[PDB]
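new request in #modeling-help
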Amino acid sequence: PLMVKVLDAVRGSPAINVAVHVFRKADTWEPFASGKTSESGELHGLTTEEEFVEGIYKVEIDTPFHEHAEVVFTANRRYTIAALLSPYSYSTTAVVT
Amino acid sequence: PLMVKVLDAVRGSPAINVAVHVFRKAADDTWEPFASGKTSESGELHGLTTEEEFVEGIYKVEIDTKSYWKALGISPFHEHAEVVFTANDSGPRRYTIAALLSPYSYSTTAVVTN
Amino acid sequence: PLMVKVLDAVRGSPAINVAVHVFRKADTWEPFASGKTSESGELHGLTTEEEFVEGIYKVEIDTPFHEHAEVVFTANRRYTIAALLSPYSYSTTAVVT
Amino acid sequence: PLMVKVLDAVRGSPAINVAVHVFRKAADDTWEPFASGKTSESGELHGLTTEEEFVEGIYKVEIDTKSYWKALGISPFHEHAEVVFTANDSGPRRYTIAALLSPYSYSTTAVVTN
């Protein structure tokens, strides 16, 4: 029900072996799921539909400048959270089907 | 030293009266409130901080986009647009966080000057 | 060797049934390939590796404001041209593997 | 009535001295040269046209990004960043084309004011 795809805007490639942390809003953040992006820049199998209940979720992407993406959304369909990384910028898109 | 500029990609206009919250990471890893405001008619927010108070650290900028879109009659995806970055670790710099907003997508760009 | 994916940033969905025209630089533009995006917002089978030779290509995406994406690049790997559409903005990303 | 602003997402800075070419579609569907210039130290380009000459029509803005990146020591994907749009079909408006550049990605946003 939830997938994450990370792309590298400098190289035009998947961002590989990037640590991704997913949190669910308790109201502090409690760890929900995590992994490292694959060769395709993807992270699948983070959760099941049974455990991916309604609530607020945060996707953190931990890769001369340090910045960090934090994607916060209400969920519950299938969700793809895409992020495109640059040294001084990122973009994120949600595809909900 | 710290400003925020927000554009609306649905209207092709500045995003006006968008709430922005800035936090700074404290030594014990909590987020302390640092500054807040709302964007002007030009989609800009100035006066968040002074050079004295904007010390080296890790800062989190949250742009309250859900409230913005809903007031426009759009049901958006994200709660906020958010970015975390390290500031002033090579001495004082001036930072503009430039955000481009769509209901299901956003970008945040740091424009850093010396 | 060449695929195109179109997304809708207002709806968080594939952009479906959007006409896409591909041109190759002759130096005017001559039609190289075209189609309409599928249910997944994708356009596959535009060309074969044999015919996708080195050169300059242009991908045109024809969907109170009218604007139009034109993505121009030198090719020749596999190329994914992604575009994300908004009423007054678009983004495009190239993933080359 | 027509300005261009360009940011560099690799350097987190304005994109300076980037060539920009604007074209207008003629009645017989050819593209006629309309205006050109280079961005300033602030990444901005003004003075492309006057209100008189910026009539209703379809305009194409090309930002010469390949030359820009290569001078920086980056091998980019695109030849240019390009956008085609209809201008002034509801009477005169002022347009800013705001571009955000990375080697393998860009966005172009029209900020339209009355």
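bot summary: The beta strands of chain C are 2-8, 13-14, 19-25, 29-36, 42-43, 55-62, 67-75, 79-86, 89-96.
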